[PDB]
DNA sequence: AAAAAAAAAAAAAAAAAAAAAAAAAAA
DNA sequence: TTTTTTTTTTTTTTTTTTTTTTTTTTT
């Protein structure tokens, strides 16, 4: 079944255009352990996620020998948020009332090096990927800029940040953080490309959103999603001078920051815009529940003087 | 355990196959999976020159390519009969023993999106200001290329049941009973005409159209199965498809073999 | 007879011209009689020629014959024998596609539906009784085409590969607009006695005599030139190749060229084999080498013919 | 005299080989183009070979069209004036009275192939047209036996494979299209017979349905006398009846099982019977008509094959006899052995001092160049091209065989009179022989 | 035995036994020029097949036949080819022969069922390899298309690709160091690509160091789990510490197939480079050593060839010359005879696809007639140079051989010609041959009395 | 039966035409 | 502004040279 199972799961993952939540792979495993009738009763979800990780390790040995890879990244909007969004769509078709730990790991299928062989693996023309790069530089440039105002109570970043603040402190008598900075440009500016037309950008953004990398927020704004990790993994951001996380040093463009005057002041000694320390929502949760309440760069206090990033 | 060290050695002594899997796995992502041999050679002549090895006989790296593509994930390169490693044109195709009895998962979780993507008889996909959540539910494929098998199982199941012959106007007047417009209005999910869908369907060699010429009357054309639908399908699985469409279980289906064959004869031919 | 060939070729051309309308007609309807309305004419035009069996007409005939067999093929494919029991007929499977593509539709709009080797004997009021009520929907948006798009992807053998962006995002741009005036406007095109073998024979049998004899000592020589003194040798070689001069060396040393005069007898029934076997008495050739300095030594024998 | 038109009138040269712009008209049936070779001799014939739809690979005077261009120019074009003005012509109602075909080749891009009408109106710019107009005029330009190549003669005589001469001769005199098309039509007939043998099973199914429907009619209206035909004396209706009701349950179960077979009623049973009967009795007619048509086609095909065998034997013997009759001018002779098993054209020639049959590669020069002419002139009556061209038939043979070549080719161009001729030899036969009989012309560059 | 002017390696007089039209006939050659002539198919162009078969040559070098015994006159049993050749003072190391005899006779007697029969050197039994090496040592080769061309290969000259033209025009003296130089070049060419692959192995080492960074990350993750395992004792500070270590450890570390992924795969890549580069350098040094000596003499030879060729070519009507090319890295050194036939056209190459029969024949003659001094060859066999040649291009191609064979220091020109033009220009030392035929010839099969009688060189015997 | 060039065979290399797409001009 | 024609580019399919390999005459 080793051939069979390790042959099924990769098909599952690269059929879905790449990205696929962990609680779907762990159910496909129960699908295929019954398709070859290898039933099990002495197991819990721990052995199951262990076996899934083992199979992914074997498949990754083979693929890394071939030149592709199955990364294992986290989506940074948090356990409760992602389990809500996923197992909220599993209420009509559901398996046998099994319990799943609210997980966040997102296996992704990407190529390591931009060789000449996989140079042409696209549906897009020249102008279309030119627009893609132009759009993503607009995404990061709009990300660097912070502005003042009232932050909405509609996005899930905001509700979750407030919930975990209240749960950690216990004292609910706290106000809103007074700024926001978005890595998600609005539509009307990306529509303003020079060479292409408007309807072209319309249907092109629709196509990209269908290719599982340009998720569109509830307000009608799109960012960049889990096929960012296939794109200049960290110099994608340090190129436009965006730093990384704190608790894990992986990427983060949405979560919690503290851009107050202390951890501020990007390095003008060299000119590179090395901005503030950025957390992930679960990263921020742990850093505030079991470490401190202070920005580590220049000793701030962020439970009152933090930033919303969206 | 022979498989892992076997494929390791295979990819080791042969570094042109490792730089060929990552070509045929990125020419046929989901578009036309045919690869002409002329091209397969014009790329292997350059992916072995800059590889520090004398390129071996085609019938060696062919078995090598099949061994790689079968071991890592489950694919297969295969030559189609053009009217073995001598087929003038090769296609990819899956080869793992299918698991319908639990591909229930992959049919359900891609059928469920109908209850959420069209309400009140309109498609809500091109609504830009909408809360797209697919990456968190793992929507099992695209949607401008899922109603391209949606309309390609109701054009190659109305040629698989008229004895490999259906005229043009008959096919249009047999599709208009499904709602697919034909005067020139784009089909309102995948945003394309019907004549251009058929033309691009010809370019993928799913069907073949027969051109005639009559200066006084005009031209009529017929839609007989091409080659890709003959190799990337099969009677052993067309029985499965048509056994599910009728929803009849394994008891009242014994006749389906000869029932299909005496109504489909010159389709599974060369 | 050329006229018959001309006119029957014209008839072949006419039938081949109307053949395309014939083929379109049989393609549309499915009637065999057009394969015979022209078969009678081609059989006629075939048998109409009886005196010369001229190729090319058979070639046109071969093209007409493959065409007639082709029309027969088109017609023979178009037979349809429908049963009442066979549960795979067209209007019983399109009305099952249009069954499966709307089960979720019937559960969504809550418009419920009720029940209305076997040798294939009879079954009609179970697979055409209530599998035909689903036959009046003609709008696209009603069917979940996301369920017979995803019954061809996990039943067929489609090749499910995805789209990677690390590679194609790093291609080069193309500002390589071609060169103006590589080379245009040329338009410059400016509107602006060799054989003479019988001469020696007509000298021989007019001056020497029908059985006279001379030598190298008399014939090939020339007192002034060397050209005309070797061209004579080559003409002699041609003549003796034609078998018209007798050259057998006497033991005196000089050669003997005498006019081979066969006493006039045109009967060849044995003269032909006599000549053929006398040549088969192989003439191991006399390599008649002549140099430039010894052209003046063998004038006649001691430097005198006519200097 | 009557000349079935299709004879090339004018060659118009624009930047070809070694000629910028010169145009010289052709003659009636035999023309002499002489001078110095290369200096306007094989260029004209290469123009005639290419501008009739042939590549330059099989010409041996330039392996690429783009190499044939005058060095000092960018585009070459050659105008070929066919003659469509007499019997057997090609669509005199559209193409005027003199077809004009030309081919424009340039150092890049695609070569230009155009049909132009008489006045100048461009007809169709396709390569499938020029390959159709001459196919109508039936001029085979590719194979050497019609258009001989100055550089390919000396190798064609000896160096050609045993199968080369055979296949060229066969497909040159149209004798192979017949075999190919007849075998192809036989294959079509075999596939059609297989489809008919498949249709026989469906017709058997229809027959079974018709007979069982008749059985249903019988088993339906068998209960007529039991409950209905007793209407005789009951007109008074519409005591002592001791044995009235006997088998009411048996008749009830019988009627139940009879009407509950699938769900049709009595009239509906008879209706299905009638429908299946009409289906059977129409499919019978269609099947039998198709069978008769196929059988008549097959018998016509057999009558084609026997005539093909006869025509092949006749053409081969005509070639053999005219070959020998031309060889007997130099007092030696041989025979052509069309071995249909190994597919050869072995030329067995003998001299004036031999015995056993010699080889085809043994003899040379005199027993070669004069076998070239002797094999070619046995492929000019079978092949019926409207035009013919010779370029240095005397590749290496002296002056006493050039005369026995010229005075034989002039004669063999009197028996047939539909073919125009152009001969390319650098020698001097202008006013040297008695060629004053009209139909010839002198053209020295 | 008037060997007064015969240069060594030459042939003096032929005598034939049982050939295709020669049952017993004996030639009597000349030292300078023997213009073979005669009527068509008179067995006069067979003396060339005889020299090619009597100097132990192959059968394919003529083209007349394909098999070896096809020259045995059908009707006979065995064929005898007796030919005499002047002895050389430089040719030695030969069995059954001394160095005093001034005349050696090589004779090969071909049988029926035995193509490869025995030979005959001065009436002594000799094997095949011995006579082959002897005829090689007589500085006479027959494959050199610039020296020995048969009737069925006269215009197989222009169909010779350039590279082979250089090889077969410089193998008139010696240049095997050009072959070893090509071997050196290909060794350098493969070494260059191997070096570039090593320069990519450098990036492999860089990637391995990055993977070592990931290894250290995996060890720190293992350290987190070490703390987690060491402190698990639920029997409040301790509890708080346990909760601050659970989420701290990333639950996605894929070091399983990375920890011991690569330890010793790079030292084997770094076990070949330095002395391999030094060997590339010494290969370049030896290549320069070999290339430095070649060019000067190899271009001086070609300059002499060009001067003589142009002085001979100006008679046709327009200029032309031969130019060497050394463009590629020595594996495609090639020569191109460049010709102009009238002024306004440019200077073009020589190949089949360019010029006619006449122009290519003029080139094939004038190239191998001006390559005279610069090679050691006693006899040359020009074969019936009339294919597509008119009068002006035949009188000249003949006059420019006569005035080369009668100026001084003449090698043997074997010239056969069925055609014959009036008013040529003859000179002293030439020997006009001929071949007779016709059943009126006194067949000397039994009586060798009149086997040569008629030649005007032995007027009193 | 242990070397040999040999015959013959398969299998890649370049060439030319056709079709699709884009650009440019006229109405 | 839109449609049609020109034009360039790409793709596919034939043909000339070229290598291969079992068979095969042979020492
Ligand atoms: N195998 C053979 N056996 C016997 N006789 C032969 C054989 N081959 C050729 N011959 C005869 O011998 C003659 C050979 O003469 P040769 O080869 O010189 O002809 P040629 O080269 O055409 O003459 P030229 O080139 O001088 O015009 C031919 O005429 C031929 O009939």
Author numbering:
A (entry chain C): 13 to 106, 121 to 336
B (entry chain F): 12 to 94, 117 to 303
C (entry chain G): 43 to 158, 192 to 267, 285 to 399
D (entry chain D): 75 to 312, 895 to 1101
E (entry chain E): 32 to 266, 867 to 1092
Question: What did the published study say regarding this structure?
Answer:
Each complex contains a pair of SMC subunits and a set of non-SMC subunits. By contrast, the Smc5/6 kleisin (Nse4) binds to smaller WH (winged helix)-containing KITE (kleisin interacting tandem WH elements) subunits (Nse1 and Nse3). The Smc5/6 complex plays multiple roles in DNA replication and repair.
For structural insight into how Smc5/6 engages with DNA, we focused on the budding yeast complex that contains five DNA binding subunits (Smc5, Smc6, and Nse1-3-4) and the Nse2 subunit that stabilizes Smc5 by associating with its midarm region. This hexameric version of the complex can entrap DNA and its activity is enhanced by mutating the Walker B motif of Smc5 and Smc6 (Smc5-E1015Q, Smc6-E1048Q, or Smc5/6-EQ) to slow ATP hydrolysis. The complex was mixed with 72-bp dsDNA in the presence of ATP and Mg2+ before proceeding to cryo-EM grid preparation and data collection. The structures of the head and neck regions of Smc5 and Smc6, the Nse1, Nse3 and Nse4 subunits, and 27-bp of bound DNA were determined at 3.8 Å resolution, whereas other parts of the complex were not visualized due to flexibility. In the DNA-bound Smc5/6 structure, the two head regions interact with one another in an engaged form (E-head). The E-head of Smc5 and 6 constitutes the bottom part of the DNA clamp and interacts with two turns of the DNA double helix. The N-terminal helix-turn-helix (HTH) of Nse4 interacts with the Smc6 neck, while its C-terminal WH domain (WHD) binds underneath the Smc5 head. Basic side chains from two dozen positively charged residues contributed by the four subunits line up on the inner face of the central tunnel and form contacts with the DNA backbone.
